[PDB]
Design a protein around this nucleic acid. Structure first.
Ligand SMILES: Nc1ncnc2c1c(C#CCCCNC(=O)CCCCCCCCCO)cn2[C@H]1C[C@H](O)[C@@H](COP(=O)(O)OP(=O)(O)OP(=O)(O)O)O1
Ligand SMILES: [Mg+2]
Ligand SMILES: [Mg+2]
Ligand SMILES: [Mg+2]
Ligand SMILES: [Mg+2]
Ligand SMILES: [Mg+2]
Length: 539
DNA sequence: GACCACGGCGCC
DNA sequence: TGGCGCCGTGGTC
């Protein structure tokens, strides 16, 4: 390319180098742009950032996040990563995408800008004729990148002192559990090592090994294994209690307070737009899509996520989203009627499991019912179902045959999806987002059947993801008009932050937007809550 | 310090 | 059952 002085003309493709992967923590080492056979290298990256009208190119969102961090309203535009990801969700990295579509992902800004230009040209050519994928790009992925950029740059408030105090409390309880475990074992060892624990439980002690690890074929010390050994030895209960506490402390309680940004005073995650095979987003550095909520201690951690002073959090969650999506995709008359009548499968399944009335079903019980409903739907064996519910094989078998007898179009839709997946080499969501599943015709039954479960799950999980993405795109400008913020997304959940005076209005509006984003054969219902913290904003 | 693989497990 | 990312361990570089 012909070397030309900064700045570049409008609509140029940008290239940039960061000191680290996280845009909120990165130092902009270099900045460059490419257009019309020319390449423009910035003398000073930060200053040159102001000359750009938009971030157009590879990893456009990340540069936009860094710009927002610096108080610059620099929206992300075209990004070859998004084009490639729509063609094939296995296109997750700039290294892979570059190699596959015409170039190399180097560590020089000028070359990255030149790469972005060429990749866009080729990938745009690949999307020609693909109207449905083009629609997803223009209407979903590209505008969503802007929304995500704001979310990442905004961050969430965290009660640091609360967590640091909690750490000291948990540490003492952990000490009590490990002391008991070492006594029961008759000797101390590394309780954090599953290899050492395996020897203690199965060799040294008398406990029998139930299962094996997937990859190394060693005797498993997993939860499911320990759950069945709870009455065989008192050490098992202690190990399980130790597991939970150390898990939460090492993953959440301890590292999270150390990640508060010195300028924003808030916690900043990354929403990865090209990281899953189904079309879902992912969250990392840190992951804020797996903050605990099940156990009492997990709930205490959840409460540490709070609203800014003078603000309130608004939490919105789609009701039974993937079941409703299933009703639309399969076109099952009965399943459609279930939601038209306003029934709840999760509640009904829970009442059956625990043998209680519908009014007796609590959130924890309803949570367990989700494992059953989605598990059975996505091909859980009758053997495991019997084990999960501690029931005979016939009863578990009776539940699955009953599960599909009510909705005949479901099994039919699954089989249709599978055949089409084998023939075309891919399956697709309602909007046409595709996933290539080549192991549908594998020799090995375990490999082939696993691929099948991946295959017919994607149109359901992916469509729900498409719906949520579309809702976020529509909702965001409405929130900016009201002075509200979009903070987090948890697959079918949205967490907003609104000024107290407008909190109620924002909640109503956001509920309406999500419910009416893209109507199906069944209505979409959204549960909404408001509160000072994430947990309270749900209850 | 870094990467990887692995078991394990947090959430949807 | 599916979809993720992060923990410590173990091994390595
Ligand atoms: N085990 C699985 N296997 C396969 N797929 C799974 C799952 C799975 C799960 C799980 C266990 C934990 C789920 N979450 C809870 O039970 C805690 C929810 C508390 C907050 C409730 C918010 C609404 C409040 C209403 O008052 C979710 N999914 C998929 C399928 C779901 O449709 C989608 C979103 O899950 P959720 O929102 O948790 O459950 P649903 O939306 O189906 O029901 P909802 O509870 O009415 O929202 O994610
Ligand atoms: Mg830091
Ligand atoms: Mg939901
Ligand atoms: Mg949810
Ligand atoms: Mg309505
Ligand atoms: Mg793994």
């Amino acid at each position: 390319l012909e070397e030309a002085p900064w700045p570049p003309p409008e609509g140029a493709f940008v290239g940039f180098v960061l000191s680290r992967k996280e845009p909120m923590w990165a130092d902009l080492l270099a900045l460059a742009a490419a257009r019309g056979g020319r390449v423009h290298r910035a003398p000073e990256p930060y200053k040159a950032l102001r000359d750009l009208k938009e971030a157009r190119g590879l990893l456009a969102k990340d540069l936009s996040v860094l710009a927002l961090r610096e108080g610059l309203g620099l929206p992300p535009g075209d990004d070859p990563m998004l084009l490639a990801y729509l063609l094939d969700p296995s296109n997750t990295t700039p290294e892979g995408v570059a190699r596959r579509y015409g170039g190399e992902w180097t560590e020089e800004a000028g070359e990255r800008a030149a790469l972005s230009e060429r990749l866009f040209a080729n990938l745009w050519g690949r999307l020609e004729g693909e109207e449905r994928l083009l629609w997803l790009y223009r209407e979903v992925e590209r505008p969503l990148s802007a929304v995500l950029a704001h979310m990442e740059a905004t961050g969430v408030r965290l009660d640091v002192a609360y967590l640091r105090a909690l750490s000291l409390e948990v540490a003492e309880e952990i000490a009590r559990l490990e002391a008991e475990v070492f006594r029961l074992a008759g000797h101390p060892f590394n309780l954090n090592s599953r290899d050492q624990l395996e020897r203690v439980l199965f060799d040294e002690l008398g406990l029998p090994a139930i299962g094996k690890t997937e990859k190394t074929g060693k005797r498993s010390t997993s939860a499911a294994v320990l759950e069945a050994l709870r009455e065989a030895h008192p050490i098992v209960e202690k190990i399980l209690q130790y597991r939970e506490l150390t898990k939460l402390k090492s993953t959440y309680i301890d590292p999270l307070p150390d990640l508060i940004h010195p300028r924003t005073g808030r916690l900043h995650t990354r929403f990865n737009q090209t990281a899953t095979a189904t079309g879902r987003l992912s969250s990392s550095d840190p992951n804020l899509q797996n903050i605990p909520v099940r156990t009492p201690l997990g709930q205490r951690i959840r409460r540490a996520f709070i609203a800014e002073e003078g603000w309130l959090l608004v939490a919105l969650d789609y009701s039974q989203i993937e079941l409703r999506v299933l009703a639309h995709l399969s076109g099952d008359e009965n399943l459609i009627r279930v939601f038209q009548e306003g029934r709840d499968i999760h509640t009904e399944t829970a009442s059956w499991m625990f043998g209680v009335p519908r009014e007796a079903v609590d959130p924890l019980m309803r949570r367990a019912a989700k494992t059953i409903n989605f598990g059975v739907l996505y091909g859980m064996s009758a053997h495991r179902l019997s084990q999960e519910l501690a029931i005979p094989y016939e009863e578990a078998q009776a539940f699955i045959e009953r599960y599909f007898q009510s909705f005949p179009k479901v099994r039919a839709w699954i089989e249709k999806t599978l055949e089409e997946g084998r023939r075309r080499g891919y399956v697709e969501t309602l909007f046409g987002r595709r996933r290539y599943v080549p192991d549908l015709e594998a020799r090995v039954k375990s490999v082939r059947e696993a691929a099948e479960r991946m295959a017919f799950n994607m149109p359901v999980q992916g469509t729900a993801a498409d719906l949520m993405k579309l809702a976020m795109v529509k909702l965001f400008p409405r929130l900016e008009e009201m002075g509200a913020r979009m903070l987090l997304q948890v697959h079918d959940e949205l967490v907003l932050e609104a000024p107290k005076e407008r909190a109620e209005a924002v909640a109503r509006l956001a509920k309406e937007v999500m419910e009416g984003v893209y109507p199906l054969a069944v209505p979409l219902e959204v549960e909404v809550g408001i509160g000072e913290d994430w947990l309270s904003a749900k209850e």
